[PDB]
Amino acid sequence: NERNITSEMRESFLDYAMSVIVARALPDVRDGLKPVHRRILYGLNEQGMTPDKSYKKSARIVGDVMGKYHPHGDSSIYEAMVRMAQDFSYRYPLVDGQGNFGSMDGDGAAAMRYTEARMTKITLELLRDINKDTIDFIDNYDGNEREPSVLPARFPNLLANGASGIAVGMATNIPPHNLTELINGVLSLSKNPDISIAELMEDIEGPDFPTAGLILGKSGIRRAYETGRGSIQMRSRAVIEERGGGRQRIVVTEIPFQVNKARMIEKIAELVRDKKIDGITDLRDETSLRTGVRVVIDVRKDANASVILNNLYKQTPLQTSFGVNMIALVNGRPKLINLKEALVHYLEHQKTVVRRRTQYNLRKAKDRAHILEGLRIALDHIDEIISTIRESDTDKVAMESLQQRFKLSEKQAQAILDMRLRRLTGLERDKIEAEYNELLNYISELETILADEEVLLQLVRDELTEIRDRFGDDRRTEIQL
Amino acid sequence: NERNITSEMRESFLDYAMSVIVARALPDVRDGLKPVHRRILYGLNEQGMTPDKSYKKSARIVGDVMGKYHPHGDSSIYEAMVRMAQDFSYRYPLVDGQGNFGSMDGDGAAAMRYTEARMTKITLELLRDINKDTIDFIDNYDGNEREPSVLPARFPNLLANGASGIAVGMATNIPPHNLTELINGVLSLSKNPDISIAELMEDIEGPDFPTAGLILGKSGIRRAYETGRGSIQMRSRAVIEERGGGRQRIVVTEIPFQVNKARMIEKIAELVRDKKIDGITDLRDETSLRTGVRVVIDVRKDANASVILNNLYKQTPLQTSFGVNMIALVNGRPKLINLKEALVHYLEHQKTVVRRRTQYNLRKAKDRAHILEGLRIALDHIDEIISTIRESDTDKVAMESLQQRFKLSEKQAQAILDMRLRRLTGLERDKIEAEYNELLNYISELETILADEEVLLQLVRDELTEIRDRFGDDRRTEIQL
Amino acid sequence: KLADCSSKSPEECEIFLVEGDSAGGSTKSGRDSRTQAILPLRGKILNVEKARLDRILNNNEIRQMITAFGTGIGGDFDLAKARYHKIVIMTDADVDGAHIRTLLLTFFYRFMRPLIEAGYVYIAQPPTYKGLGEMNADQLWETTMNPEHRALLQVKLEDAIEADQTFEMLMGDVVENRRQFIEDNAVYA
Amino acid sequence: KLADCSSKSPEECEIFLVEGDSAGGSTKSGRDSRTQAILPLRGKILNVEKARLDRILNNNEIRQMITAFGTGIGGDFDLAKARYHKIVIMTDADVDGAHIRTLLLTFFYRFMRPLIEAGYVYIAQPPTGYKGLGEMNADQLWETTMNPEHRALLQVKLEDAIEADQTFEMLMGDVVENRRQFIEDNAVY
DNA sequence: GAGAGTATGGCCATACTCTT
DNA sequence: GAGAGTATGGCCATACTCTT
Ligand SMILES: O=c1c2nccn2c2cc(F)c(-c3ccncc3)cc2n1C1CC1
Ligand SMILES: O=c1c2nccn2c2cc(F)c(-c3ccncc3)cc2n1C1CC1
Ligand SMILES: [Mn+2]
Ligand SMILES: [Mn+2]
Ligand code: NA
């Protein structure tokens, strides 16, 4: 009949606000992903796009993701996927990209018509053990398909690659981190639930940006890790060097995180043009793939280059600040979390994953041990088995006789009926016995794990340490003073 | 070295023209399709988008065709697919579309995001028996898939839906036709290979446009069907009728093929505005879904309305000609063809398709008869077979023993070793025997066809007639004299 | 992109606001062209509660709506000049559609409040996962376009002090109030 | 959209005409900024042979090439004003990239003939294959096609001015029949 | 500032040829 | 002539937070 306007406003806003908050703009604290990213990677797994396989066309990748899980526009999906493939956006890229996927200068990637993609090796670790009933699945938008509610995330990806998202009523800004340091942190925490932030900071010095550069001071760090919020100052890496004739120059090899380089040069150009900055005779971008990033500024003869450099930090994006605002979904709700919180929730995710994995393996193994027993029984009593089947007119009749004559379960009987005649040869009988013995030992080991919380915990520590050794790398960002 | 400019121009130009001629702008005489259309239809098949299944998002359809078979921009593909889904463009639509797929005002269809598509039922007859080895496949552009060189085309689709295509150094314009008459013509041609274009024209009266209308005179049809090139005059269907007060109006209910309506109406309005036609007082587009096309031109009281109508035919697309130029790929190269070569080349395609299919039915029948003969030998002496297998230590030995003891081929022995234990039950035994007996009769039926070219033909005639009865429809366009 | 009815009588004329140009581009083939107009919205609509007048007036999307209604804005707004006595908000039945809906209701409530009070503003309601989009124009016309089967909702204003606060709280440039409201009312299940 | 090189001495300079701004974007990342420049052409460029003169003048695409070459067109041509001593036509090694090339050569042969005699017109040689220029990474465009140490460019030359006159007229000329006959005579099916 | 990031589609240019 | 129909990308609006 009628729709009171104030009611319509409050109800309609909350749907968008909650939906943007819990289903778009904020990462899950456990795997560090927002839904579009998670659906891209899960889609890359489901399609069969692993690092050992062919690069696959983006349009089909995007279309598969959009049709199956993400009911939104294709550009959003492609752009999200492209970012995961840029070594200057992602400290630990999740997508391997073939073709023009962009550059630091802000020239965007090519149309999805020209690019192909697949997982990187490290993304296998995000999807490791997904099938083994480690994470809860949910229905997709139309109900046709199942999607993961969260990935196993066998490395701490929230902190490793960071996040930035604008939501409604809040936003988030989490900087990337060094993986060797994060994992060492998680290990320390797993040995001491009462570990302090300062103690954690011994293992985790601060952010580590894919673009290197420098951070000025640990005090901005320390507040961000203690509280979830803090301003961290990032500097470009620049030196002063002679160029001949008694003249000098300023050479920049690294720039701040999320800073368009081409745009930064323009701002420096403008400053000069507007005479706001004094003493710059030339400005050239000498960046090349072979040489890396090189930005050259030519100081006027007998001018102080150190002063000019300081002004550039002051009046330019050369020195930029990163506003840490660590907000993530915790139990499906937005929450501001400090560094220890983030690791605590992560470690609890890993325990759940490994536990749930051991349980699935144990269940899977026992079922096989049970089927093997029927095969062992069937092989020993084979002659009778064959006549029993031959006597019977139907599978149903044949099944019934086998459960009577040999006290077999329905599954055991169906397995026997499904057996191929080639399983009757001499090697197979020995082969079956060998496998069965292996399972029993395997089941013993699985049950041992489940019984002891400490044993389970140690396994997590062990699997994290292998990932650290294989994927952990040198810190790129220097933390000065 | 260097390159002679004259040599460059000749080679580069010839490279383009030939590709445009043989792989873009011209239809194949056998299935009536240009590459992009064939790839779209094949792509719908492979995706499983049959008419019994639900509509699919157009973007996914296109992304698959583009990546798999057509390395070209999406607009070319999407727009080609849209055309095939419009009743005013295709006399027998090959694509079923959900959403806004266009109108006769020239307003385009909706973007790929907003439309859904699948095969029409008639398209299943273009794709019928494609798997049964009836046409030659070729490698696709990147080596990574296979695509059809031509579709089986169980109904004469070049002539029925027509074609229009601008190439290089030539072009093509074939009008659509009525399916019932087309097939009756093929039938007459099959009974009489020295039949004359005149005689064929007792079945094929002329074109049959999706939009109905009138063709003025039989004189330019005949020229086109005899020489391949002719002009055909089209007229809107228009009547003169009272509207009250001793006043009249001209009412147009059908417009010529490929005429844009909205444009046509604007040309009339403009003529009125610029006083280049006397006597029109109002102009309304009254067209609905319900009531068909209805364009009303109200006529000044006591002015003559036939005379106004006649002028509108002279000055507006309300009367329009269609320039027949029937060029198609015949044995992979462009050729101007008359009505008989079109039908000859089609009917020869149908004989090839049907023969090749029967032969393939044979080969896989005979193949399967062979396997069932093995299983029957096994079932006849099952106790010895089991013993032979159990005595062997490896599958290879069991294979060689089975072949040796019972005179089985390698294929038969492999089949026996793969046979499950449940196939020994009474019902499962009876099934092997029953399949064999039916298969001997089928093999006998197939050999009858291939021993006798007249049987093989008669089968083409029957299958064509079945298609004609199910899909043939009334003629829409009136041929006036 | 505006489509307008044959009738110039504002009493029997209705204008549809659709999210998606060819979401509404379908409708045109389906819609009764005698009494129905279509105004497609390209994207998210300027949030007028957060924008100053020069920016509002300059915005293309807003200008089209003003022009289409023809009443003018603010002080010069004239009711008797409304070109349609039904204005319908047709959005996707999803959260971005909900978000868009709040933006529009904001535009009306701040710049054309009289229109709301008359009862000229309505909210269309299509089929109870597929929004306006992959849907036949005839189907679109049948579910919500035709007067003989459709279920529109009339936007009532009850308390103007409450609406002022609510619009300011939800659409204002102060983020904290909006976050606070979300925390208090969001229920997760 | 021209992306100019760092140096200002034309003897060492090269300019690249790139098909599509995917191939182009890639080329801007890949090239030697110091000695190489990129100009992408967005669409099928006009056939200057068939078309009226004034169309050639209002055209943007034609205009961006004139500006880049730095000479002026036809009668005002200054080969000493040539901004680049190397002009590279870089298009996909597909039949459509062949077409664009013929069109560009036609423009040079009718309005900047003095450059073909000079010898600064070159045709790049990308890897042949299914892959186009847009689908390749920036550094593989460099190693295979733009690097002076490993690339293979072909110098365009004019070896007979009346023959070329007759060829350009026949292939790009208004008459279709001459073009059809050349195809019939020379096509290998 | 305006930009960090996922969300919600129109409008352009050209080549090529023909009705005996 | 005219416009039929397969081919050849880019541009750019908005909401939403926070900040240097
Ligand atoms: O691929 C397309 C395309 N598909 C549909 C429309 N267009 C285009 C429309 C266009 F108007 C233009 C274009 C516009 C202006 N100058 C050059 C090309 C290009 C299109 N292109 C590619 C060449 C880029
Ligand atoms: O879907 C898109 C989109 N994908 C990539 C870029 N855009 C858009 C860019 C755009 F600039 C606009 C737009 C342009 C002009 N006026 C409003 C929106 C719309 C885009 N849309 C439509 C959903 C809105
Ligand atoms: Mn929607
Ligand atoms: Mn290409
Ligand atoms: Na700064």
Q: What is the DSSP letter of C143?
A: I
Of the residues C12, C32, C96, C173, only one is catalytic, namely C96
Quick one: CA dihedral A70, A75, A79, A81, positive or negative?
positive
Contacts of B191 (CB under 8 A, 6+ apart): none
User: CA–CA separation, A204 vs A224, rounded Å?
Assistant: 13
Q: Which nucleotide is nearest to B165 (CA to C1')?
A: F5
Other Cβ atoms within 10 Å of B469 Cβ, number: 10
Question: Helix A395-406 to helix A410-418 angle, to the nearest 10 degrees?
Answer: 120
Going by the DSSP 8-state scheme, the letter that residue C3 receives in this structure is: B
Return the nearest residue to F15, CA–C1'.
C44
Closest ligand 1 atom to residue D44 Cα is 23
Ligand 2 contact via A75 beta carbon (within 6 Å) = yes
What single-letter DSSP state applies at residue C62? H
Tokens read off for A353 = 């994953």
Q: Which helix (H) or strand (E) segment is C14 a member of?
A: strand C14-19
Q: What are phi and psi of A72, to 5 degrees?
A: -140, -175
Q: For residue A67, what are the contacts with CB-CB under 8 A and spacing of at least 6?
A: B57, B60
CA torsion sign, D173 to D174 to D176 to D177? negative
Q: Is B407 exposed, middle or buried (0-12, 13-18, 19+ CB in 10 A)?
A: exposed
Rg of chain C over Cα atoms, rounded to whole angstroms, equals 17
Beta strand pairing status for B295-299 and B248-254? antiparallel
> Ligand 1 site: residues with CB under 6 angstroms?
B 73, 75; D 42-43
Place of tokens 């992306």: D3
Tokens of A365: 């193994």
Q: How far apart are CA A198 and CA A188, in angstroms?
A: 12
Contacts of C180 (CB under 8 A, 6+ apart): none
- 3-class secondary structure, C138: helix
How far does residue C3's CA lie from ligand 3's centre (Å)? 22
**D59 CB neighbours strand E below 7 A:** yes
Contact C167 A9 (CB under 8 A): yes
Q: Is the CB of B99 under 7 A from strand E?
A: no
User: What are the residue boundaries of the structural domains of chain A, listed by start?
Assistant: 1-481
**Tokens 């009836």 map to which residue?**
B134
Q: What is the largest CA-CA distance in chain C?
A: 50
| CB proximity A18–strand F (7 Å threshold) | no
Cα of D134 to ligand 4 centre, how many Å?
A: 8
Q: Residue A312 and residue A299: Cα distance in Å, rounded?
A: 12
Q: Which chains touch C (3 or more CB pairs under 8 A)?
A: A, B
Euclidean distance between CA atoms A444 and A366, whole angstroms:
11
Evaluate whether A116 touches A98 at the Cβ level (below 8 Å). yes
Nearest ligand atom owner, CA of A256: 5
Q: Annotated binding residue at D19?
A: yes
Do the strands D87-90 and D36-41 form a parallel or antiparallel pair, or are they unpaired?
unpaired
- For A110, the closest of D22, D30, D142 (CB atoms) is D22
Kindly tell me whether chain B and chain D come into contact, counting contact as 3+ Cβ pairs under 8 Å. yes
- The values of phi and psi at residue A239, to 5°, are -130, 170
Is D54 annotated for ligand binding?
no
Q: Write the residue with the smallest CA distance to atom 16 of ligand 2.
A: C42
- Out of D156, D182, D183, the one facing B5 most closely (by C-beta) is D156
Contact in structure between A463 and A351 (CB atoms under 8 Å): no
Q: What are phi and psi of B319, to 5 degrees?
A: -110, 135
Neighbours, chain B (3 or more CB pairs < 8 A): A, C, D
Give the 3-state DSSP-derived string for chain D, with helices as H, strands as E and coil as C: CCECCCCCCHHHCEEEEEECHHHHHHHHHHCCCCCEEEEEECCCCCCCCCCCCCHHHHCCHHHHHHHHHCCCCHHHCCCCCCCCCCEEEECCCCHHHHHHHHHHHHHHHHHCHHHHHHCCEEECCCCCCCCCCCCCCHHHHHHHHHCCCCCCCEEEECCCHHHHHHHHHHHHCCCCHHHHHHHHHHCCC
Give catalytic residue positions of D: 19, 92, 94, 96
**β-strands B333-336, B327-330 pairing:** antiparallel
Of all nucleotides, the one whose C1′ comes closest to residue D22's CA is F9
What is the DSSP-derived secondary structure letter of residue C132?
A: S
Write out the two tokens for B136. Answer: 């030659």
| Closest-CA distance of chain C to residue B212, Å | 21
List of residues 6+ apart from A331 with CB closer than 8 A = none
> Could you give the CA distance from residue C13 to residue B283 in angstroms, rounded to a whole number?
21
Question: What is the token pair recorded at C49?
Answer: 């509660």
CB pair distance less than 8 Å for A289 and D142: yes
- Could you tell me the distance in Å between the CA of residue D43 and the C1' of nucleotide E13? 6
Residue with CA closest to ligand 1 atom 5? B75
Known catalytic membership, residue C76: no
Tell me the pairing of strands D87-90 and D14-19.
parallel
Q: How far apart are CA D94 and CA D72, in angstroms?
A: 31
Structure tokens at A321: 């600040």
| A 280-309 residues, CB < 7 A, strand E | none
User: In terms of DSSP bridges, do strands B116-119 and B95-98 run parallel, antiparallel, or are they unpaired?
Assistant: antiparallel
β partners of residue A3: C155
| Spatial separation of the C-alpha atoms in residues A159 and A231, rounded to whole Å | 17
Say yes or no for a CB contact (<8 Å) between C22 and B55.
Answer: no
What three-state secondary structure class fits C169?
Answer: helix
Nearest-CA neighbor of A93 among A85, A102, A101, A104? A85
The secondary structure of chain A, three-state, reads CEEEHHHHHHHHHHHHHHHHHHHCCCCECCCCCCHHHHHHHHHHHHHCCCCCCCCEEHHHHHHHHHHHCCCCCHHHHHHHHHHCCCCCCCCCCCEEEECCCCCCCCCCCCCCCCCEEEECHHHHHHHCCCCCCCCCEEECCCCCCEEECCCCCCCCHHHHHCEEEECCCCEEEECCCCHHHHHHHHHHHHHCCCCCHHHHHHHCCCCCCCCCCEEECCHHHHHHHHHCEEEEEEECEEEEEEEECCEEEEEEEECCCCCCHHHHHHHHHHHHHCCCCCCEEEEEECCECCCECCEEEEECCCCCHHHHHHHHHHHCCCEEEEEEECEEEECCEEEECCHHHHHHHHHHHHHHHHHHHHHHHHHHHHHHHHHHHHHHHHHHCHHHHHHHHHHCCCHHHHHHHHHHHHCCCHHHHHHHHHCEHHHHCHHHHHHHHHHHHHHHHHHHHHHHHHHCHHHHHHHHHHHHHHHHHHHCCCCCCEEEC
Query: Binding site annotation covers D78?
Result: no
The C1' atom of F1 and the CA atom of B316 lie apart, in whole Å, by 15
Give me the half-sphere count of Cα atoms (radius 13 Å) on the Cβ side of residue B387: 6
Enumerate neighbours of D (3 or more CB pairs within 8 A). A, B
Give the Cα separation of B416 and B379 in Å (integer).
10
Question: Which ligand 1 atom is nearest residue B73's CA?
Answer: 1
Which positions ≥6 away from B151 have C-beta within 8 Å? B31, B33, B38, B41, B42, B126, B127, B130, B135
Distance from CA(C175) to C1'(E5), angstroms, rounded: 18
Q: How many CA atoms lie within 13 A of A250 on its CB side?
A: 27
Distance, in Å, from the CA atom of A270 to the CA atom of A277, rounded to the nearest integer, reads 9
Looking at the annotation, which residues of A are catalytic? 114
If we measure between CA atoms, which residue out of C49, C160, C64, C54 comes closest to residue C107? C49
Q: For residues D36 and D14, is the Cβ–Cβ distance under 8 A? A: yes
Contacts of D22 in chain B (CB under 8 A): none
B68, B70, B64: which is closest to B36 by C-alpha? B70
> Measuring from atom 22 of ligand 2, which residue has the nearest CA?
C43
Verify whether ligand 2 is closer than 6 Å to residue C149 (CB atom).
Answer: no
Distance of C1' in E16 from CA in B106, Å: 22
B 393-452 near A (Cβ less than 8 A): 393-395, 397-398, 416-422, 424-428
Chains A and D share 3 or more Cβ pairs within 8 Å: yes
Provide the Cα torsion B71, B73, B75, B79; round to 10°: -20
Q: Please list, residue by residue across B310-342, b when 16 or more beta carbons sit within 10 angstroms of its beta carbon and e when fewer do.
A: ebbbeebbbbbebebebbbbbeeebbebbbbbb
C19 Rama class: left (phi>0) / alpha (psi -120 to 50) / beta: beta
Burial class of residue B268 in the structure, from the number of CB atoms within 10 Å of its CB (0-12 exposed, 13-18 middle, 19+ buried): buried
Count CB-CB contacts under 10 A for residue B269.
Answer: 12
Short-list B216, B175, B221, CA closest to B202: B221
DSSP-derived 3-state class of residue C40: strand
CA of A477 from ligand 5 middle (Å) equals 18
Question: How many Å from the CA of B15 to C1' of E2?
Answer: 50
C44 touches strand E (CB under 7 A): yes
Q: How far does residue D158's CA lie from ligand 4's centre (Å)?
A: 27
Residues of B in contact with A385 (CB under 8 A): 421
Between CA B139 and CA B149, with CA B143 as vertex, the angle to 5 degrees is: 15
Residue B221, both tokens: 């049809």
Its sign, for the CA torsion A81, A85, A86, A89, is: positive
Radius of gyration of chain D (CA): 17
Helices B5-23, D177-186: axis angle to 10 degrees equals: 90
In degrees, rounded to 5, the angle at the alpha carbon of residue A315 between the alpha carbons of residues A311 and A318 is 85
| Smallest CA–C1' separation from C172, nucleotide | F16
Which residues, other chains included, contact C124 with Cβ-Cβ below 8 Å and sequence gap of 6+?
A: C16, C88, C89, C90, C91, C144, C150, C152
Contact A464, A188 (CB under 8 A): no
Map residue C158 onto helix, strand or coil: coil
Q: Is there a contact between D86 and D13 (Cβ–Cβ < 8 Å)?
A: yes
Bridge partners (DSSP) of residue D16 are: D38, D88
Q: Is B75 on the interface with A (CB under 8 A)?
A: no
Distance, CA of B228 to chain centre: 21
Supply the DSSP symbol for C31: S
| Method by which the coordinates were obtained | X-ray
Q: Is C135 within 8 Å of B99 when comparing Cβ atoms?
A: yes
Give the bridge partners for B137, in sequence order: B148
Instruction: Quote the CA–CA distance of A84 and A94 in Å, as a whole number.
Output: 5
Question: Is residue B296 a contact partner of residue B286, using CB atoms and an 8 Å limit?
Answer: yes
For the record, the structure tokens of B144 come out as 């990574």
* Ligand 5 centroid to residue A475 C-alpha, Å: 23
Q: CA A257, CA A210: separation in Å to the nearest integer?
A: 8
The radius of gyration computed from the CA coordinates of chain A, to the nearest angstrom, equals 29
* Nucleotide E1 C1' to residue A315 CA (A): 13
CA dist B283 and B316 (Å) reads 14
- Cβ atoms of A55 and A117 within 8 Å: the answer is yes
CA nearest ligand 1 atom 9, residue: D43
Which residues, listed in sequence order, are joined to residue B251 by a DSSP beta bridge?
B239, B296
* The pair of three-digit structure tokens given for residue A381, joined into one six-digit string: 């009593």
CA dihedral C74→C75→C77→C79, nearest 10 degrees, is 120
**Is residue A206 within 8 Å of A215, Cβ to Cβ?**
yes
B358: nearest Cα among B447, B246, B260: B447
Query: How many helices and strands (H and E) does chain C possess?
Result: 8, 5
Does the CB of A231 fall within 7 Å of any strand F atom? yes
Q: Is the CB of C43 under 6 A from ligand 2?
A: yes
**Rounded Cα gap, residues B45 and B123, in angstroms:** 10
- Cβ atoms of B95 and B165 closer than 8 Å: no
Give me the phi and psi of B60, to 5 degrees please.
Answer: -65, -45
CA D101–ligand 4 middle distance (angstroms): 12
CA distances from A161 to A96, A126, B204 (A): 15, 12, 70
> Does B103 contact C26 at a Cβ distance shorter than 8 Å?
no
Residues D109, D164: Cα–Cα separation, whole Å: 9
DSSP type of residue C119: T
